[model samples]
Target: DLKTAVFNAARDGKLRLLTKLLASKEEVSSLISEKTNGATPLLMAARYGHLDMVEFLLEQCSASIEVGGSVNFDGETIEGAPPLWAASAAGHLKVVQSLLNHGASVNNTTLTNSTPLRAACFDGHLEIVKYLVEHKADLEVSNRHGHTCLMISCYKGHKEIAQYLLEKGADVNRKSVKGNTALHDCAESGSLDIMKMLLMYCAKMEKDGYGMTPLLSASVTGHTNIVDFLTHHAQTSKTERINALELLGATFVDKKRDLLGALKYWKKAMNMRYSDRTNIISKPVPQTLIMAYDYAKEVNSAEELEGLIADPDEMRMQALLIRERILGPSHPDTSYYIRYRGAVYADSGNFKRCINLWKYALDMQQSNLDLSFAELFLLKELRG
Candidate 1:
């Protein structure tokens, strides 16, 4: 792992030491191809946004910008992602721009078929995207994932980049290799800005694509806010937010009792976040209850919620029902409320009613067949 040390100096612009490393006959090229963990020096440097180190290593050691770069000292290949993709994925706009300027191939694609341009767009580096596009990167080139630049741009809320890609002839309606279109990705991403632009550009979002939209993505990711934002604003009815708030107000809602300072421990869910054409719910984002609880505590907004609790039932129920309604019937709120009610029935000595509601709720959940959805379970305690 001393590669970190060797390269850290280069990134620090310690030209004298970097020159020594470069001039060594001990396969400086080995440094180029040797991955710390399937990641070459180039990959590591790119990942860390070490612009000078990346440029120097690639230039001095003849690091190939193309895919499946050469083998290393340990006989392992630097075969994962391209330097530009790593840099782009790390949001290293300067490194990315430098890499592309050095003939790193703005359109150089991977075996997995993702280009640096797509990666940059997905990572939300609009400036890097603009830089690559201005330098003649192919906007139309897609990844093996069938991800077009517009789809990546739209999903990450990079409106200007999305617009630029659209102007450059990227298909606004571009579908991923998996058949999800840019609008589909946008809907799932809860990207209101990008979604508006896509619609303005005529991305062909009809009913079928509507099902493929963020409504479904919200269900899959279980984000109440995203579902709320989308359903309230984007659909056929612009007046729905008011009515939706009213419906939420009318619902039988008992807010969760706040646990005292239960959110000090927040590290349990950091690295689990991911990206996809659909919604990518991060492990510990505000969308998750634990983090949301922690965030609520930090912002000290519980007083407002506490005040709302004392509001008259008519006012509260009217508020809650309409709120739920705007998020669409398929939202996580739909499932969350059903789960809350089921738990409530169980708590009130109505096990049979609880079981009945659970049955229907479970069935609704099953119909969607969401990934990782739990099915029938036994009640026996664990024997371990």
Candidate 2:
């Protein structure tokens, strides 16, 4: 009970209670070294960033011990990591320094062999990283995923931390268990600056375990600019270039609404070398006119629609032909579609144009003997 109380006090930074309890202790050694969930009182204090409590435990109680806390996201404990590691991971710079001063192993690892330098770098704590680096933290040590500090830094897009690691001779080409290099992680982030930094260091451009090189990964993420930069800046294949153009064109047309720009990319892709890996022509409809037509209907920009139209008279003829192919002019659905456009014009207060359009539709229907329900409703609303 007293040990539990001491652990609680240390964890909560209750300096007075912790000291009084330790004074009541038959042996201060047991109180200081007691473990809760694999964490010693000194480790708890360091983790919670209680500088005074950490000082008291280290100086007054003289607890220099190795243990663990802060379970990984995969729900596994990183056992045997000491007080310095806990403080470093929590970003408690002062507690980390004090632990270092007390000769805490700067290179000590958990069960998975994750070191203090890695913990600091993973959390992106500049001061702790600096202190650990100054104390000669191992730059090449990896965790369970074979992720070195440089890999973790790149994964998090911590350009400065990545730079520091690189400057200290951290290997940029180190691959994880899944064969992902730091450059692969950088590509995933789409951080151009970070990519350039890694590239400058001669980070390799090759496929990971997923068969995705930097350009392929960038294309999958819809980062066309990043894809282009990688393709042009590096030695890319004709197949790779064609695939990149096809993906960019599809994204711009279907998602980004830049149909004109998509057309240019599509045209370029058509001229490139075609293979099973490169050609998108095998798909049912590589470039459908329906996409352009649907997009044209929804556009409100007068300048955009005006620029897109090849010719007003020619487009009208095409529209009439399309409708005639789908349904004859006398069909109710065909007349209903025509009325819907008039309804929109009427909604916008262009009643004269709306009336003219409705008159044409009624004539097409060939029955003015009984007015349609819409006409009755419109006439009643007009009179009211």
Candidate 3:
């Protein structure tokens, strides 16, 4: 309606149009404070870093400094943020400061329990973060979702902001709604530096309220380096040691390619795969067994391949059939199956049949195998 139209004009920095709209509807100041999800006039202008637009709204339109808002246009209902929170989230240092100057409550929180300081940290806005700090914004406050600035900074991989918050006494171990500490967030992103810093501050062996250790958090996310680092660096308790070993085993098997290390970890933590809380690897990652099969193939032993996953004869037949399925029988890559079949024929002492297979295979693959000249020479000799 008129409210959305005026607020959109304010958000888009259409200053003349906004001014014209406001002049026509003097009561639109009510619209300025009413939440438009994302665009309350003063909040919208500040969110976009429109300093002049902000000044006009605060000075000329007499907009409220601490109002809530919500938006409903794009099939999503995003709750409105206050003007300062908006500006800080947008990394608009000037707008943030302007709002503060116009008596924007430094501690004003929005519908999501978000503050300007948390938004600044979440967005990696160093200047705005420092400014918010200087203004004495509450360092301990969390958003409606229970995310603190420090937790979000770590989750976002913003090392500088995390360190800054830590230095300024932000809680390194503060839990969010899910009981996720900054350390858990660090593990989630595989951020070793932040994880180390958090550990130094005694973020010790803490589990997420949802039963995830920092080690398992990294493990589940497939960060091999982070998982390895936590195995040695994190101070796991007796029970957690089993969790760590299981996590390390999977990391080694799936991502690290250290099958020996995986076996050792599995040995140390027996019954873990069987206990089955986190679906902790019913077996190794498919590649571990596949690599074993590849190694056996190098030794020229179908017996070893048969011992893995299936029967030897069946495996060979399946492999032969797959060549045709994956790379049509006439494709050059499928020609290897012809060589294998020829080898089997030769092993059975059917030399003439094996030789015939070789000739047929060579003729079929002349172009792809770059044997056109050899083919021509053979054809010339036969003709002569």
| Candidate lDDT (C-alpha), each | 0.53, 0.66, 0.65
Find the candidate with the highest TM-score and give its number: 2
- What's the TM for model 3? 0.63
Q: Residue-wise lDDT of candidate 1 within 37-123, one digit each (tens)? A: 455566556656777777777777667665433222223232446777767765878888777777877766655566678767765
Q: How does residue 5 of candidate 3 score in lDDT?
A: 82
lDDT of 2 by residue, 1-384 (tens): 888989899989989998887887637986678777677888778878999998878778557555555432224345666778878877899998888887787888876777888888877897889899999788888877677888777767788998888888888888878777887667666767777888888888887765667776665445666776876774677666766665555445434545665555655655563334454332222133422122223212223334434543233223322332233455344455456545656898967656765776777788523347567481101000
Cα lDDT for residue 135, candidate 3: 92
Cα-lDDT of candidate 1: 0.53
Candidate 2: the clashing residue pairs are none
Candidate 1 vs. true structure, TM-score: 0.57
Where is model 2 poorest over a 10-residue stretch in terms of lDDT? 291-300
TM-score to true structure, per model: 0.57, 0.65, 0.63
